[PDB]
Symmetry: C5
Subunit: 114 residues, 5 copies
C-alpha cells in the first residue's frame, strides 16, 4: 500500500481548519477537517485511529504532521482512503475517511502524489 495509490483520493490547496483528539475501542484517534484555501468547495473530514486499519503504523507521524500544518495554516494536499471507519456514530460525527497523507502546496503544485 502507498499514500499515492490511485485508489486513494486527494484534495489540493486545502487548509486544516479543525482538529479533534479522542479514544475509541482502546485506541487513541484524531480527526481533522480541511477546507479549500480559497473558500470554495466542500470540507474534507478524515481520521486516523492508532490500532486500526493498514494505516495504523503512521498514526503518530500523521498526528504530528497534522498538528504541524494545523498550526501553520499553510495550504496542503490531503490524501485519504474512503470508506474505512465503520462505527456508525463515529462516521456520522466525522467520516469514514482514513487520513493517509499530507503534502505541502505552493502556488502552482503540491509536493506529493497526484
Amino acid at each position: 500500500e502507498w499514500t499515492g495509490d490511485n485508489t486513494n483520493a486527494y484534495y489540493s490547496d486545502e487548509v486544516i481548519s479543525e482538529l479533534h483528539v479522542g479514544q475509541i475501542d482502546t485506541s487513541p484517534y484524531f480527526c481533522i477537517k480541511t477546507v479549500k484555501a480559497n473558500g470554495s468547495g466542500t470540507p474534507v473530514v478524515a481520521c486516523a485511529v492508532s490500532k486500526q486499519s493498514i494505516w495504523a503504523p503512521s498514526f503518530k507521524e500523521l498526528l504530528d504532521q497534522a498538528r504541524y500544518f494545523y498550526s501553520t495554516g499553510q495550504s496542503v494536499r490531503i490524501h485519504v482512503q474512503k470508506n474505512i471507519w465503520t462505527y456508525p456514530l463515529f462516521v456520522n460525527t466525522f467520516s469514514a475517511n482514513a487520513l493517509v497523507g499530507l503534502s505541502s502546496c505552493s502556488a502552482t503544485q503540491c509536493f506529493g502524489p497526484k
Copy 2:
C-alpha cells in the same frame, strides 16, 4: 467505549485556563481547568491518569493536545466521563472527571461528538 458515547458529558466553547502535571500511585497524570469563553457558568476540571481507567491509552495524545490548546487559548469542546477518579483528596483538589477528548471549535459548531 468512545469519546462520543452519550454517557459522557461535554462542554463547548471553553478555554483552557489552568494546567497541572504530577504523579499519583506510580502514574503520571495531568489536570486542566477550563472556563466558558464568555466568562459565564462554572469552571470545568478534568484529569487524565497515565496508568488508570479505560482512557489510559490516550494519555499522551490528550496531554499533548491539552498543551496545544492551552498555549493558543482557543475555544474548545472538552469531553469528560464523570465519577471516575476515586482518591478523595485528589477529587477534592481537582475532580472525578476523566478527560476523554478535546475538540477545536469554529464560530458556530465544535468539531466533535455532541
Copy 3:
C-alpha cells in the same frame, strides 16, 4: 504516593528562571531554579532524575512541563519532595529536592494541591 501529599512542600507564584539538563549514574536528569515573580524570597531548586526515586515514572512529563513553563515564564506553583537526591556534589550544585509537580498560577490561586 501523590504530588499533593502533605509531606511534600510547594511554593506558589514562582517563575522558572533556570534550566539544566545532564546525566548522573546512568540517568538523564534535569534541574530547575525558580524565583518569586515579585523578586522577593529565596530561590527554589529542584531536580528530576530518570529511573531514580519513586517519582521516576513522571520524569518525561515533568521535563516537558518544566520546559513549557520555562519558555512562557508564567507564574507557577512548584511541588517538591525534600531530601531525595543524596549524591553530595550534585546536592551542593543543585539541591536534594525531587521535583514532583508543576501547576499554573494564572486566574485564581494556583491550580494544584494546596
Copy 4:
C-alpha cells in the same frame, strides 16, 4: 556507514521548501524538497522511510530536524545517499535519494561533513 561517507552526495546552502508525510509498505515516511537559498540550480528531493534502508535508525531524528529547518527556512546542507528507494511510482513522484543528514549553514560554511 556514516552520513559523511564520500559515497554520499550533499548540497550546501539549500532551503527546505516542501514537506510531505505519508506511508508506504507498512512504513511511515517523509520527503522534502530543497532549493538553493540564492535561487540558483535545480531542486533536491530526498526521503526517509521508517524501518527501511540502513538509515532506518535515524528516521525520527531526521523527521524532527527536517520539520525544524523547514519551519525556520534557514540555509542547510542536505546529505543524501542516491539510488536507495526502488519503488518506481514513489521514485517518480519523489526520488530514490535517502535522506541521511541535515546541517545548518553559516555565511561561509555548513556544519557537517564535506569531501
Copy 5:
C-alpha cells in the same frame, strides 16, 4: 559518572550557533557548535551518539535540550567529555567531544556544575 565530574570540561556564556543531525554505525547522532555570546574565543564542538559511550542514556534529552537552546539563542554553559569519539573522519569533521550537559546562564552565573 556525572555531567559535573571535574574530569569533564565546560564553557560558560556560550550560544549554540550550529546544529547537525546524522547517523554513524547504525546510531543516530547529533552535533552542536557553540561560541561565546560575545563572539570572542574559539568554537566548542560536541556530539552525542545514541548507542555509544557512557552518555548514551541522555541522547534524547540532550538532543531536545540542544534544539531548545538553539532555537532561543540564549546564553548557556556547555559541558563535554573530551577524547570520546574515535572514528577519525568524524573527529576531523566535528570533534572527539561528547556532549554531557547544557545549563542556562544568567548575566552573572550559569545554572550548573562549575
